[PDB]
A paper describes a structure:
The tripartite motif (TRIM) proteins form one of the largest subfamilies of RING-type E3 ubiquitin ligases, comprising more than 80 members. TRIM family members typically contain a RING domain usually catalyzing ubiquitin transfer; one or two B-box domains mediating protein–protein interactions; and a large coiled-coil domain region, which is involved in self-association or oligomerization with other TRIM E3-ligase proteins. About two-thirds of human TRIM proteins feature a PRYSPRY domain, also known as the B30.2 domain, in their C-terminal region. All characterized family members shared the same overall PRYSPRY twisted β-sandwich fold consisting of a 7-stranded and a 6-stranded antiparallel β-sheet.
Numbering used by the authors: 531 to 559, 569 to 710
Amino acid sequence: MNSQPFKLDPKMTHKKLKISNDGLQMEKDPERFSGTGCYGAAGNIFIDSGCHYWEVVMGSSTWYAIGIAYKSAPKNEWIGKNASSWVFSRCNSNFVVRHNNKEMLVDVPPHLKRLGVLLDYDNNMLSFYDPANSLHLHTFDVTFILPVCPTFTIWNKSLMILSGLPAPDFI
């Protein structure tokens, strides 16, 4: 594994997010707001080689999108709705992977609170895992044409980033 620690990039973080001092936690500062306004942030590293693994703790969030993007994705447009963004997304009961405004359903075990992100840049893959259940969720087969940056987007609650990780045994 090539995995290195990274944190959120303050220049790429939505101004309405509360960020921890280590740059690893982001939080939005029975009727709910359905407004599609997302709160996105990008990591402070770009990758164009090697094999990288990180995890995200989603806790109680019910609406989030986690993945990678080229620099060409516009700021705060990291939810798979352009050709520069690849995400795993939850919205309440719906789990998808999304890229270029095209989705595929993902069947996810109940009560997902942690996501694993495996970027095998050299072998043209981005894979999502359920680490609690030690299992594969989805692989994009993609030959990246620019460097990629981790991205993290919420509509509610908070995320925590676990970076610099040894590939768990289920890789």
